Amino acid sequence: MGGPVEILPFLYLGSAYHAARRDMLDALGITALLNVSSDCPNHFEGHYQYKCIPVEDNHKADISSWFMEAIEYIDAVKDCRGRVLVHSQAGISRSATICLAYLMMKKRVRLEEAFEFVKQRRSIISPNFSFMGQLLQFESQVLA
Amino acid sequence: MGGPVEILPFLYLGSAYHAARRDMLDALGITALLNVSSDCPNHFEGHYQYKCIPVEDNHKADISSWFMEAIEYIDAVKDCRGRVLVHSQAGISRSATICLAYLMMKKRVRLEEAFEFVKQRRSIISPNFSFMGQLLQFESQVLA
Amino acid sequence: MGGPVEILPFLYLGSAYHAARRDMLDALGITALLNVSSDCPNHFEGHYQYKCIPVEDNHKADISSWFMEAIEYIDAVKDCRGRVLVHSQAGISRSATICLAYLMMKKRVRLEEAFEFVKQRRSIISPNFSFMGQLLQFESQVLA
Amino acid sequence: MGGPVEILPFLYLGSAYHAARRDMLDALGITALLNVSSDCPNHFEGHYQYKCIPVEDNHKADISSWFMEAIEYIDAVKDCRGRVLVHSQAGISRSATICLAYLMMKKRVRLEEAFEFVKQRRSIISPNFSFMGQLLQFESQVLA
Amino acid sequence: MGGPVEILPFLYLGSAYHAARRDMLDALGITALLNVSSDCPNHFEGHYQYKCIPVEDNHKADISSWFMEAIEYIDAVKDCRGRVLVHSQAGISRSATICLAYLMMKKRVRLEEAFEFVKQRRSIISPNFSFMGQLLQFESQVLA
Amino acid sequence: MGGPVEILPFLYLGSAYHAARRDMLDALGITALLNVSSDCPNHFEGHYQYKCIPVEDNHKADISSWFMEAIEYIDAVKDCRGRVLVHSQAGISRSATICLAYLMMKKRVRLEEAFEFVKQRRSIISPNFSFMGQLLQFESQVLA
Amino acid sequence: MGGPVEILPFLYLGSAYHAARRDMLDALGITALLNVSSDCPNHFEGHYQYKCIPVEDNHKADISSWFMEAIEYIDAVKDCRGRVLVHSQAGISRSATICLAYLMMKKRVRLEEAFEFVKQRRSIISPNFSFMGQLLQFESQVLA
Amino acid sequence: MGGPVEILPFLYLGSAYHAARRDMLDALGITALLNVSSDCPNHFEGHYQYKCIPVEDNHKADISSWFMEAIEYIDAVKDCRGRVLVHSQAGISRSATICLAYLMMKKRVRLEEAFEFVKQRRSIISPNFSFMGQLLQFESQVLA
Amino acid sequence: MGGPVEILPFLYLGSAYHAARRDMLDALGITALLNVSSDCPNHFEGHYQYKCIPVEDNHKADISSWFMEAIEYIDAVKDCRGRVLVHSQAGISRSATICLAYLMMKKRVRLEEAFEFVKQRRSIISPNFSFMGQLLQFESQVLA
Amino acid sequence: MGGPVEILPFLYLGSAYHAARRDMLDALGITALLNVSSDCPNHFEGHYQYKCIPVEDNHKADISSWFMEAIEYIDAVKDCRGRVLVHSQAGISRSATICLAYLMMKKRVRLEEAFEFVKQRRSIISPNFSFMGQLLQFESQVLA
Amino acid sequence: MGGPVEILPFLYLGSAYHAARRDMLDALGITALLNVSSDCPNHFEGHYQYKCIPVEDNHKADISSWFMEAIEYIDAVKDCRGRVLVHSQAGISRSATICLAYLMMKKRVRLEEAFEFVKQRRSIISPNFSFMGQLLQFESQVLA
Amino acid sequence: MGGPVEILPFLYLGSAYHAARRDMLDALGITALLNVSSDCPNHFEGHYQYKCIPVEDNHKADISSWFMEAIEYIDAVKDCRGRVLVHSQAGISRSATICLAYLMMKKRVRLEEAFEFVKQRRSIISPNFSFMGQLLQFESQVLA
Amino acid sequence: MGGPVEILPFLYLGSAYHAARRDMLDALGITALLNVSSDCPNHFEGHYQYKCIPVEDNHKADISSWFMEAIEYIDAVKDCRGRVLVHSQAGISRSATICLAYLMMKKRVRLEEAFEFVKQRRSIISPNFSFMGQLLQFESQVLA
Amino acid sequence: MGGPVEILPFLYLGSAYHAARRDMLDALGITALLNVSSDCPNHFEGHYQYKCIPVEDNHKADISSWFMEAIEYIDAVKDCRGRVLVHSQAGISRSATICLAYLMMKKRVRLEEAFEFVKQRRSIISPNFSFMGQLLQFESQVLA
């Protein structure tokens, strides 16, 4: 817990624990949620916009494929002047990988630079190696 | 958090966090809620009376227009011998501006005096400047 | 808060705050709830048995009339081998008065003795004077 | 409270208090719940898989009969690569007995060894004597 | 002990212990004493004005009857510009009930308000329930 | 000093020092006094009931003879719903022996049991050996 | 309390509390008492010489008139080689005024000087203004 | 104060303050009192045996004359197996001188030895010089 | 020093030390000064309004005469919406007497009540007796 | 006091207390002073440049009118490479309002931004509401 | 600094630092000043009486000559019931010498005695040797 | 502040703050002042000798030119056996440079040696570089 | 070690360590010993009564069979008014099981109740599961 | 434990615990032991002289009969210049009674005096009442 960290004015990073907290969500004015796990429920289907990205914290997980879909979604909520809560079970690997991919893309930066910019927000960050490589593979592409 | 502050026996001021807490709401015997934000959900639509006042914590926000509608609503719940929870995301600007407008009106007082009477209740109070001016514009009118 | 106090194995006393806490309710195995207030909602209508006793913490409140209906209800849940949570806003006056009335009746005792037996459970107990007199009026009757 | 203990990667032990906490459930990625009590509600019927095993923390409780049904259920959720939360009111007797029965069976071990393996996880463990005997009766059988 | 509390400039509340202390009596300038017990002696019959009100700290005690006689006596000593020491064995129930009855009457106030005004003076105050009811019965009458 | 200990609601044990203290006597509501010494004066002959039992804290003292007379007296004051203060110089031997004899008799118990019941009240208790033997001699008789 | 202060070998100043204390009186060897109040009793009429000077701690009190009578009395007890205890309720105003008047007279000194000589004895001294003026009026006269 | 010191089982030394304390007197079991002052009253004439020895704490005091009368009195109370409280205003000079004279006589010892034996009991002892000389004059005689 | 105390929004009480402090004067916005001494200079004749009331801290001082002139002056500065600093050498007797007289008059109150109202402001207050009497003489008149 | 705060190298904000301190003025090298009060004197007319802006800390004060005159003056002293001390009685409202108006103008910024920039310098800042509104009215204009 | 010491009710000793402090001067009620230096200015020529005694803290200084003139001046201010502040640069040598000469003369005492009487007031005292001798020379003469 | 440092018996170094302090000036017996700034006023034109040396704490300041004029002035006051206070705004650069130049000249020493001799007096010393170079240029010349 | 715990006046529970301590045995007055292990020697065969019950702390141990023999033995020593020390190697499992069986039987109680009654005596108690079941099997029988 | 106390050079008092300690026995050079209990073994029959006195710590114990036999035994070991250890289970009642009887006899003293002489040795001493009486009965006889 502790509360979701504001990566960008419209982009927040958090735990699945946070996703189940309406008080926490509304206190931050979150309007949408990006469930970057595969089974975390979307309890408040009626009041918040939900987008799911069914991934496992694996090496056997191809989280890179969804980068675009996710980025889109985020940009989407960004344009409605809303606030998305990208989140996964612990908010360490998955939800982070994605916030990184988005930052690398939108703001065009090194996985390095991004990784830092975010470590400062939620020091717990730690994309498992597999994702790390995929985050690189994607990196080259974004810069091209 | 911390809990909503009782401005008037029938008037309370709080956070959107509080609005999502049934235990907190019933412990104070709140019967109605005045959502002074633009996207905070009304989760318990079925058990509490809700009134929305779609405003942003902007300078580009014309919160003054709703003063009357809001005051009415509050007076309304006041007459049912209920308890309203005027609230906005953080419970610092918006929800405050309104409680002020109401007090100035109903009890006829200087934005000054009111502002104080409330600072003593929720020291966090801080209507952004724009609202501050609008609270003055309205002030003259209430005294007339 | 703090949690509801177990007056009797099947009789608990608490706050309206507690009534809104499923985790707290199930942790104590409460099966029914006796809302001794007039507007506290019954959020979980579907999972717990609810009985309402619409009273105000007034001197202008005739809480004595419901004593029988309430006692019945409690005995009812008692027979299903359940657990009732008699409760009012703060769990100081109303919900207490009733637990007292019940104890005086069922176990036949002095308002005095009862009042004590309960002060030891939830030291916060404090039936407003009006109720206090009504608790006496009822006392004589129970002993007859 | 405190949070449910992970007995097995897919097997967790907890309180009924935990069962009412979505944030806690999703933070651990629990997908199913095994209510080893007789009246604890299943509030989130829609989002989590629920299985009930109606038992009392009695000596007059034949919890042994359900061992197989329960083990099955657990194995079931195990195969979906999910996570079950076996739980009872306090998470001391009932929910424990069952986790024990399962461990004895699946991993074939002495009630002794198991009891320990679990005491280390949730030191509060304490199957009432009746269950203890039934856990033994079942033990012989599992080893055969 | 500790010393008698000054309820009113001419009205003090205390213990029977105090009644036996000349030094304490003269130090406060007490001129009269109202023995609200049934057997406490009046040792200094010669130097202080004594008035007895033979009551027990019972439920079987009709202390209400004497309210008028007592109030009179108190008003009497009040007019001689003296100082009365209303007192009972412990100075918790009896002597208090009476000071309350007097205050309610003379100053016309709610048993509630009075009870408080006095709790602040001698926090030990505690009219047994019976008296409490009688104090109410009398209340209505005083307001009429 | 310190104050007399309440053995029974109507039976107290104390020092001769206490016997000379009106404030102390009335604060406890003592109505009668049983002087279990041979020369301690009865200063307040006029306000308290006095009964003398002229004994020495000797081995050459036949305190047993008076047991009956004393018990009577005590029962007497007991019936008037009063309070006796059995006392001797220090309140260690004599006044104790007697409270014991009375307890053994009235409530029928072992000198042992009584002795304890009282040690817990006034830990200073210590009937000189002679009395101790006489308390036994009397014990057999009371049980017969 | 605390004990009476020795102004002069034969002149002491004190409280009415002291006047009620034989132990204190004899410990100081007081033989006479000068009651400078209007209602404080003279409990030990038989053993100590008493002289009364019926005054109020008023502005409406002409304590000056008695100065001579009092001084006389004091000189009287002085000649019997006794010890007088001049005293009033609190021993702050009245009994002080008089000790001052006496000192001014007998030893011929400024109200100023005396006032001091005594403040050093009983720092609590404080003749109400009225008396203060009367103490001056008398001062001129004594010096003449 | 502090309490009278036991010089001999039947001989105690004290202050006039003590003489006025019944509680203290009876607590020690004093039966007689020897007032070695000239004006200290004998308040409890009815309950204690009193003997007066009218002396001043002077150099102009012939306390020696009474030595015999006093010793007699003391021996007297000694024979009734009682307890005398020899005492003077402060219990420093007079009452001491006498206890000394008695000791010197009865037990035949040097004023020196006695003086010590007693200093150890009431360190405050201090017979004014005059008495000191008279105590010597008497000393020679007792040894003869 | 310490700074002048604000008795009334337009009335301050202080020391002659303060009168010599421009920084202090302007920080409080004092516009006028009432020198209630007889020789304290008026250094800043050019920038502040000065009014002198040549009195001594005597008994031989008829400060009462000026009460009216002073009150006037104060009312004067009061009307210009200014701030007067009534002051004397130490700011204990003289400058106080006057603030009292003014309060008694303007707000019509007992020398008693006023004296207090001011003690709470500058606890050092202490009009010498003479002034005290004159403050009374004047009191009667103001109430008439 | 404490000393004036340096808003700009040539612009300082302070109390009227400071204005009366030459040592403080010269220590900071202040050459001019802008008296934003209505009656604070200009004691050192001969050595420092003074400019007055006669305003009250009112809601009835039109401080806005002088904004231009004041800004001019400040720019003036700015050009002589001097240092102005804008100041009012307490240095909270008036003198602040003006420093704000100047900053908004000269450096073109939001009342918001300025208000902050200054709060960091003299945390005590607090333009009464009226001025606040006037500061806004002026804001729009400056940006145009 | 620290403040000038009051040698005599009308005679004070101090530093030149003090002479420049009006607040300090008026707080003590100094009316005249005796500048015992040769160049210290008399800043407040208009409000205080000044007398100069042009001396150096030398051995080559004939301060004795002025003794008479100075004493006169002091006596002068003494008669107007004023207060003189004799002072020199540091208030150690010069101003002291003079206060001494005055004391020796007026009160007729040994340079020794005086020197002490003053050391106790301003421990810093230290007339340079030359002055010391001159103070003696003068001593003989004063005694004659 | 803190006070000016005595460089030479007739030469002191200080702040402009000091220059505004008469008490400080006279306490040190300063007779003349050398204002080494360009705008610090000379408030007490009438009582102290003033000499101005209009310089800026610049690099663009030719403070060297005035060295001779200044030295002269200083020597001048030196001959009148007076005391000069060389001073600039902070008393760090300007006023120091000059005291150095003077020392170098008068006592003929290395800028080095002087700089030290003075650092020990006012550790704050710090002639800006420009002055430092000019202090060297002048050094060679003084040694020639 | 630590010493054997007194379960019953004639029944103690302990370690094999204790069995080897004569001092400990005689200090407790143990007369007999019940060796509930299989190889612990009976060193003092000559002085204490020994009874062996050859069991292992196994699951493969049929300790139940001996329950009767053991109970008999214990009752035996009980009748000789002796004291048995039931004990096993560590005094945790075996010796406990037996004390339990005995208590259940003799005093007829639930394995539950007994287990507790003993846990309070030797908190270390812990019959291995096997024994636990056997203790239940036996339980039913004892109640029949 | 702690070790046996040396009552007499040849007489020691102790616990049965001590009796089992050879190291303790030889360290004190005990040669004989007097077992004043009824079942404590005599483990070292071969090395120490043992004498048994079969008594219970009862009231129903006639320990007096053995007094002579015991005393004899003790005198016996005394003559061999040995050392006896009189002892009972705890060494509080029995073994003490006997050491007392012996002392009373051999050294002829009051049970009182002896009791003390020994309390100082082993403060734990406490002959049960029965023995106490028997110790008295025997006392008279020894003195005869």
Side-chain angles (χ1 to χ4, degrees), chain B residues 59 110-113 115 129 133 136, chain J residues 59-60 110-112 115 129 133 136:
Chain B
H59 35 299
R110 286 283 180 60
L111 165 52
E112 182 185 304
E113 169 172 32
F115 192 73
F129 305 133
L136 285 169
Chain J
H59 35 300
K60 305 170 185 171
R110 287 283 180 61
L111 164 51
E112 182 185 303
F115 191 73
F129 305 132
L136 286 168

Short mmCIF file of all heavy atoms in Angstrom, two decimals, chain B residues 59 110-113 115 129 133 136, chain J residues 59-60 110-112 115 129 133 136:
data_model
loop_
_atom_site.label_atom_id
_atom_site.label_comp_id
_atom_site.label_asym_id
_atom_site.label_seq_id
_atom_site.Cartn_x
_atom_site.Cartn_y
_atom_site.Cartn_z
N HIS B 59 -8.90 28.35 -12.19
CA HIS B 59 -9.04 29.79 -12.13
C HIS B 59 -10.07 29.94 -13.24
O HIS B 59 -10.82 30.92 -13.31
CB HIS B 59 -7.72 30.44 -12.52
CG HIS B 59 -6.97 29.70 -13.57
ND1 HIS B 59 -6.54 28.40 -13.40
CD2 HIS B 59 -6.59 30.05 -14.82
CE1 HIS B 59 -5.93 27.99 -14.49
NE2 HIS B 59 -5.94 28.97 -15.38
N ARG B 110 -18.68 38.32 6.70
CA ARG B 110 -17.59 38.67 5.81
C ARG B 110 -16.83 37.41 5.40
O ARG B 110 -16.65 36.50 6.22
CB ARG B 110 -16.64 39.64 6.51
CG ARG B 110 -17.16 41.07 6.64
CD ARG B 110 -17.05 41.82 5.31
NE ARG B 110 -17.53 43.20 5.38
CZ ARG B 110 -17.03 44.14 6.17
NH1 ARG B 110 -16.02 43.87 6.98
NH2 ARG B 110 -17.53 45.37 6.14
N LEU B 111 -16.42 37.36 4.14
CA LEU B 111 -15.65 36.22 3.64
C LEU B 111 -14.55 36.00 4.65
O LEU B 111 -14.14 34.88 4.92
CB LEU B 111 -15.03 36.55 2.28
CG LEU B 111 -13.91 35.61 1.78
CD1 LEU B 111 -14.37 34.18 1.84
CD2 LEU B 111 -13.52 35.98 0.37
N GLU B 112 -14.08 37.11 5.22
CA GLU B 112 -13.05 37.11 6.23
C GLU B 112 -13.43 36.27 7.43
O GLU B 112 -12.79 35.26 7.74
CB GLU B 112 -12.75 38.54 6.67
CG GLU B 112 -11.64 38.67 7.70
CD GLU B 112 -11.47 40.10 8.20
OE1 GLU B 112 -11.26 41.00 7.35
OE2 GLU B 112 -11.53 40.31 9.43
N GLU B 113 -14.48 36.71 8.10
CA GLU B 113 -14.99 36.04 9.28
C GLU B 113 -15.24 34.57 9.03
O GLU B 113 -14.80 33.71 9.81
CB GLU B 113 -16.27 36.74 9.72
CG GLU B 113 -17.05 36.00 10.77
CD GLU B 113 -18.20 36.84 11.28
OE1 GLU B 113 -18.74 37.64 10.48
OE2 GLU B 113 -18.56 36.69 12.47
N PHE B 115 -14.09 32.56 6.53
CA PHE B 115 -12.82 31.92 6.26
C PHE B 115 -12.19 31.50 7.55
O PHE B 115 -11.64 30.41 7.63
CB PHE B 115 -11.89 32.89 5.55
CG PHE B 115 -10.69 32.23 4.99
CD1 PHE B 115 -10.78 31.42 3.87
CD2 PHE B 115 -9.45 32.42 5.57
CE1 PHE B 115 -9.65 30.81 3.32
CE2 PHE B 115 -8.31 31.82 5.04
CZ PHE B 115 -8.41 31.01 3.91
N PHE B 129 -7.05 31.31 -5.50
CA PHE B 129 -7.32 32.72 -5.75
C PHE B 129 -8.56 33.04 -6.58
O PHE B 129 -9.37 33.87 -6.17
CB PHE B 129 -6.09 33.36 -6.40
CG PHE B 129 -4.83 33.18 -5.60
CD1 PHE B 129 -3.67 32.76 -6.22
CD2 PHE B 129 -4.82 33.40 -4.23
CE1 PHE B 129 -2.51 32.57 -5.49
CE2 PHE B 129 -3.66 33.22 -3.50
CZ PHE B 129 -2.51 32.80 -4.13
N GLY B 133 -11.65 35.40 -5.37
CA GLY B 133 -12.25 36.60 -5.92
C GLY B 133 -13.74 36.44 -6.11
O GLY B 133 -14.52 37.34 -5.79
N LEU B 136 -15.67 36.84 -3.17
CA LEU B 136 -15.81 38.24 -2.78
C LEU B 136 -16.95 38.84 -3.57
O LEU B 136 -17.86 39.46 -3.01
CB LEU B 136 -14.52 38.99 -3.09
CG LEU B 136 -13.37 38.71 -2.12
CD1 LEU B 136 -12.07 39.29 -2.68
CD2 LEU B 136 -13.68 39.32 -0.76
N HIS J 59 -11.12 46.82 4.31
CA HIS J 59 -11.77 46.19 3.19
C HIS J 59 -12.26 47.45 2.50
O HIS J 59 -12.53 47.49 1.30
CB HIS J 59 -12.93 45.35 3.68
CG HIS J 59 -13.64 45.94 4.85
ND1 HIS J 59 -13.00 46.19 6.05
CD2 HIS J 59 -14.92 46.34 5.02
CE1 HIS J 59 -13.86 46.72 6.90
NE2 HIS J 59 -15.04 46.82 6.30
N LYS J 60 -12.35 48.50 3.32
CA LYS J 60 -12.79 49.83 2.91
C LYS J 60 -11.57 50.63 2.47
O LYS J 60 -11.58 51.86 2.48
CB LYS J 60 -13.45 50.56 4.07
CG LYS J 60 -14.61 49.84 4.75
CD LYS J 60 -15.01 50.56 6.03
CE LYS J 60 -16.08 49.79 6.80
NZ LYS J 60 -16.33 50.36 8.17
N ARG J 110 1.81 35.73 -11.88
CA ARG J 110 0.52 35.49 -11.24
C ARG J 110 0.56 35.90 -9.77
O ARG J 110 1.56 35.69 -9.08
CB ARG J 110 0.15 34.00 -11.36
CG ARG J 110 -0.27 33.56 -12.76
CD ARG J 110 -1.70 34.00 -13.06
NE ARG J 110 -2.18 33.61 -14.38
CZ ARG J 110 -2.29 32.35 -14.81
NH1 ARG J 110 -1.94 31.34 -14.02
NH2 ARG J 110 -2.75 32.10 -16.03
N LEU J 111 -0.53 36.50 -9.30
CA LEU J 111 -0.62 36.90 -7.91
C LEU J 111 -0.18 35.70 -7.11
O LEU J 111 0.44 35.83 -6.06
CB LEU J 111 -2.06 37.23 -7.54
CG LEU J 111 -2.39 37.31 -6.06
CD1 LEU J 111 -1.41 38.22 -5.38
CD2 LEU J 111 -3.81 37.82 -5.85
N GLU J 112 -0.51 34.53 -7.64
CA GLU J 112 -0.17 33.25 -7.04
C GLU J 112 1.33 33.10 -6.87
O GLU J 112 1.85 32.99 -5.76
CB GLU J 112 -0.71 32.12 -7.92
CG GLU J 112 -0.46 30.72 -7.36
CD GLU J 112 -0.90 29.62 -8.32
OE1 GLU J 112 -2.09 29.62 -8.70
OE2 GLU J 112 -0.06 28.77 -8.68
N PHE J 115 2.86 35.83 -4.59
CA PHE J 115 2.47 35.55 -3.21
C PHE J 115 3.43 34.53 -2.62
O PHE J 115 3.87 34.67 -1.48
CB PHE J 115 1.05 35.00 -3.17
CG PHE J 115 0.47 34.95 -1.79
CD1 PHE J 115 0.08 36.10 -1.15
CD2 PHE J 115 0.29 33.73 -1.15
CE1 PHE J 115 -0.48 36.06 0.12
CE2 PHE J 115 -0.26 33.68 0.12
CZ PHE J 115 -0.65 34.84 0.75
N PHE J 129 -8.40 40.00 2.68
CA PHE J 129 -9.20 39.65 1.51
C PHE J 129 -9.47 40.78 0.52
O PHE J 129 -9.26 40.62 -0.68
CB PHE J 129 -10.51 39.04 1.98
CG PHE J 129 -10.32 37.86 2.90
CD1 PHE J 129 -11.02 37.76 4.09
CD2 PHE J 129 -9.42 36.84 2.58
CE1 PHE J 129 -10.82 36.67 4.93
CE2 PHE J 129 -9.23 35.75 3.43
CZ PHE J 129 -9.93 35.67 4.60
N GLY J 133 -8.57 40.74 -3.41
CA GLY J 133 -9.37 40.89 -4.61
C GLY J 133 -8.82 41.98 -5.50
O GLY J 133 -8.75 41.82 -6.72
N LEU J 136 -6.05 41.02 -7.53
CA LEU J 136 -6.43 40.20 -8.67
C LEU J 136 -6.87 41.12 -9.80
O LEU J 136 -6.41 41.01 -10.93
CB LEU J 136 -7.58 39.26 -8.29
CG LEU J 136 -7.20 38.08 -7.39
CD1 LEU J 136 -8.44 37.41 -6.84
CD2 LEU J 136 -6.37 37.09 -8.20
#
